[PDB]
Structure formats: C-alpha cells, structure tokens
Amino acid sequence: DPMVSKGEELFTGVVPILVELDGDVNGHKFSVSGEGEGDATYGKLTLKFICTTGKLPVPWPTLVTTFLMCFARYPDHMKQHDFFKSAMPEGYVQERTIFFKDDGNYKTRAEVKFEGDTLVNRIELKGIDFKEDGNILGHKLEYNYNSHNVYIMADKQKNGIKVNFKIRHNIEDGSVQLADHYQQNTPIGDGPVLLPDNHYLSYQSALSKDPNEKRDHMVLLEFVTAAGIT
C-alpha cells in the first residue's frame, strides 16, 4: 500500500522528539520544554521535560497525557487503521478538554508534525476553575502513573478521529483523582488520511527523576500498542 509505505518510511528507526508547552492554570503561568526520542517499531517513547520558568504549579502526572500517538506500535494486521502516521509529515492537531472530577479543567491544543527529521509537539494549555487547595493546585497527587486503554473512533464528518478516556491519578491519602479526557484530532494537510475502525491504544507510563537534574522536571518512559481489531 503506497500510503502505508509513506508512514513506514517516516517512523522506521529512532526519531528525535521536541515538545514545547505554554501553560496558564488559574493565572499561574509556566513553560515546559521536552526532548527525547520515539521508536514506533517498539511503540517506545523516552522523554525528559523541564519547567523552564521555575516551579511547575501543577503536578507533573497531570501533564503526561498532554505531553505522541504517532509513536504507537500498530500490529501489521492493523496498519490500515493508523491515522496518526498517515497524517505525517504535515501532521495533525490534537485538542483536548480534561475534566478533573470536583476540580478544574484543562483545555489543550497541540500541533504534532515533522520539523525536518524532528517530530515536534507544540502545545498551549489553559486551566480554569481549579481549587487553590485542591489536589492539583495543592500538589496532592503521587508521582506515579497507572496503565490505561484509550478508545479511538473515526470522526468522518471532520476527516479525523475522536478519543475518549479516563485517567485515575493516585492521591497521597490513598484515594484517586479522576481526569476524564475528551479528545479530537484532525489532519493539518489537505491530503488523504487513514480513518480507523474502532480500536484502542494500550498505554504504560513510568515516571522518574534525573539524579543530576536540579530543575523541576519529569522523565517519562511510555509504551503504546494498538489493539482491539483481531
């Protein structure tokens, strides 16, 4: 399939990644830069994020979903359903609203695209209606992360996809903070794209710290595999 080929030829080996985020949550401004690499053959992402404005005013785990679905490992029998690669190199827009139960919400807009050989994720995030002393602004979430399936469906009227899913962040007291994600992606280019059957992506995420890093940061290792179309 010369269309499946175009995608294969962009993601075959290790691809450098750059992420940039501009954020304002309840008027708490901040910026984050990330760098690392993806290897979609293994569904593998390795990234390190640095708050370049000082202290991040929200918990790092709350940003993980915001900070690259084009690096999902699609099994061979499922290559016809990989929208994300099919949009490259021109890329796609990823928009979310993330509703934190009993607290505020994030609204994000990202553009994911190649800049030469580098895969770039440029994001703007606005958070509103958060509580001062809540789980997010009061930093009460543990520095860890649970595994999660993400259900992708076609959005054929918009030539894109919609993705709906819940993340549960562990709170320090042992309870959980629900974060209900709503997502839409649309290609940036005018060309054809693969629009998938219903299927899901399986995520595993591991959060760690760079021992030699003094700035406020997060090291993220993710594995992502498409499934659910036998």
* Contact criterion met (CB below 8 Å) for 60 and 51: no
b/e per residue 85-121 (b: at least 16 CB within 10 A) = bbbbeebbbbebebbbeebbbbebebebbeeeeebbb
CA-derived radius of gyration, the chain: 17
Query: What are 40's two structure tokens?
Result: 């979609």
Torsion of CA 140, 123, 223, 147, to 10 degrees: 30
* 188-82-145 Cα angle (round to 5): 95
- Cα 88 from Cα 120, distance rounded (Å): 11
Query: What are 173's two structure tokens?
Result: 């007291």
Query: What are 76's two structure tokens?
Result: 């061979």
Give the burial class of 67: count Cβ atoms within 10 A of its Cβ; 0-12 exposed, 13-18 middle, 19 or more buried: buried
The label of the residue with tokens 């042992």 reads 174
CA dist 177 → 47, 49, 54, 167 (Å): 24, 23, 25, 8
This structure was determined by: X-ray
Residues in contact with 197: Cβ distance below 8 Å, sequence separation at least 6, in sequence order: 81, 154, 229
- Cα 164 from Cα 146, distance rounded (Å): 17
* Cα dihedral 58, 55, 32, 129 sign: positive
- Cα 56 from Cα 52, distance rounded (Å): 9
- Cα 133 from Cα 188, distance rounded (Å): 39
- Cα 137 from Cα 132, distance rounded (Å): 5
Tell me the resolution in Å.
1.4
Backbone dihedral region of 80: left (phi > 0), alpha (psi from -120 to 50 degrees) or beta? alpha
Query: What are 126's two structure tokens?
Result: 């606005």
- Cα 123 from Cα 125, distance rounded (Å): 7
Tell me the DSSP string of the chain.
-HHHHHHHHHHSS-EEEEEEEEEEETTEEEEEEEEEEEETTTTEEEEEEEETTSS-SS-GGGGTTT--GGG-B--GGGGGG-HHHHTTTT-EEEEEEEEETTS-EEEEEEEEEEETTEEEEEEEEEEES--TTSTTTTT-B-S----EEEEEEEEGGGTEEEEEEEEEEEBTTS-EEEEEEEEEEEESSSS----PPSEEEEEEEEEE--TT--SSEEEEEEEEEEES--
Task: Please give the domain boundaries of the chain with CATH numbers for all domains.
Answer: 1-230 (2.40.155.10)
β pairing state of 15-25 and 28-39: antiparallel
